[PDB]
Amino acid sequence: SNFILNGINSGTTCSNDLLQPNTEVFTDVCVDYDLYGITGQGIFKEVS
Amino acid sequence: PIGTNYRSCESTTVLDHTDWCRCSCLPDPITAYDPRSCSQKKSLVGVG
Amino acid sequence: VYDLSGFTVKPVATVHRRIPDLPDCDIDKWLNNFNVPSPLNWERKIFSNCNFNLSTLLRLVHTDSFSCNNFDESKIYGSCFKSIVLDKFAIPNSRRS
Amino acid sequence: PHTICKSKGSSRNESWHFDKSEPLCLFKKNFTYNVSTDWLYFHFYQER
Ligand SMILES: *[C@@H]1O[C@H](CO)[C@@H](O)[C@H](O)[C@H]1NC(C)=O
Numbered sequence: 001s002n003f004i005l006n007g008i009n010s011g012t013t014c015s016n017d018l019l020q021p022n023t024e025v026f027t028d029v030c031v032d033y034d035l036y037g038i039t040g041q042g043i044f045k046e047v048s
Numbered sequence: 049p050i051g052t053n054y055r056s057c058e059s060t061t062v063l064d065h066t067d068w069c070r071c072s073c074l075p076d077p078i079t080a081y082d083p084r085s086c087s088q089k090k091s092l093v094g095v096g
Numbered sequence: 097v098y099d100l101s102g103f104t105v106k107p108v109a110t111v112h113r114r115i116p117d118l119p120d121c122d123i124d125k126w127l128n129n130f131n132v133p134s135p136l137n138w139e140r141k142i143f144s145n146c147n148f149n150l151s152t153l154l155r156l157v158h159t160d161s162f163s164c165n166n167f168d169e170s171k172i173y174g175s176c177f178k179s180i181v182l183d184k185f186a187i188p189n190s191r192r193s
Numbered sequence: 194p195h196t197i198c199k200s201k202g203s204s205r206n207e208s209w210h211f212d213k214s215e216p217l218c219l220f221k222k223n224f225t226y227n228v229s230t231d232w233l234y235f236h237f238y239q240e241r
């Protein structure tokens with residue numbers, strides 16, 4: 001296969017490799033979260 | 049010069065050749081294909 | 097009795113979530129199609145306005161070799177493009193060169 | 194510009210845009226709705 005790169009460093013066909021991994025939602029510890037466009041600090045506990 | 053590292057380069061098997069060579073800072077440091085591997089780092093001038 | 101300045105526990109880890117906005121490119125789903133064309137009738141697909149991960153794409157296609165001309169594989173990571181034009185076919189073994 | 198009706202067919206072909214290749218898009222997504230419903234509601238607005 002041949003990858004032709006039109007309009008390099010512009011547009012919207014992007015790569016998510018250098019986007020922070022979702023990782024794990026750490027619980028019972030303080031974290032500086034950024035959830036869906038809003039930031040803060042808090043402690044997470046899982047519930048149903 | 050003594051105490052300096054040579055230009056980082058790598059040999060890869062391409063065009064059925066065993067010693068096809070690739071190097072950092074290509075094509076030039078301004079339009080570099082990747083500033084991460086290039087030893088020349090872009091830097092704005094500070095005050096003074 | 098002096099009430100000292102209120103301190104705060106410094107956050108340990110960071111958590112980030114965002115809807116990916118644009119759809120996934122699914123380049124692996126088009127490269128892994130079992131109905132591959134010959135070089136005579138080569139197929140073309142344009143990937144525009146979508147999100148992709150070449151680190152995962154190479155694992156999902158089982159890459160034999162990857163190289164770039166007038167560009168580098170390291171700069172594909174985190175970069176945006178107007179459109180990626182992709183052309184594919186099976187290789188007749190004696191013509192690999 | 195106008196749209197056509199895929200179920201009963203149309204005398205005209207659909208033509209609201211004439212982009213030979215896909216143009217730049219900042220957002221693309223498909224949503225589903227119950228076809229048996231009689232009414233649909235939509236809110237569209239801008240702020241900052
Ligand atoms: C949305 O639906 C239409 C019609 O089914 C389809 O042509 C189009 O490719 C879909 N787009 C996305 C982003 O799924």
Ligand SMILES: *[C@@H]1O[C@H](CO)[C@@H](O)[C@H](O)[C@H]1NC(C)=O
Nearest residue numbers: 226227228229230231232233
């Ligand atoms: C779909 O719409 C019809 C009419 O409003 C309603 O009778 C039906 O229960 C709806 N079905 C679902 C799955 O929402």
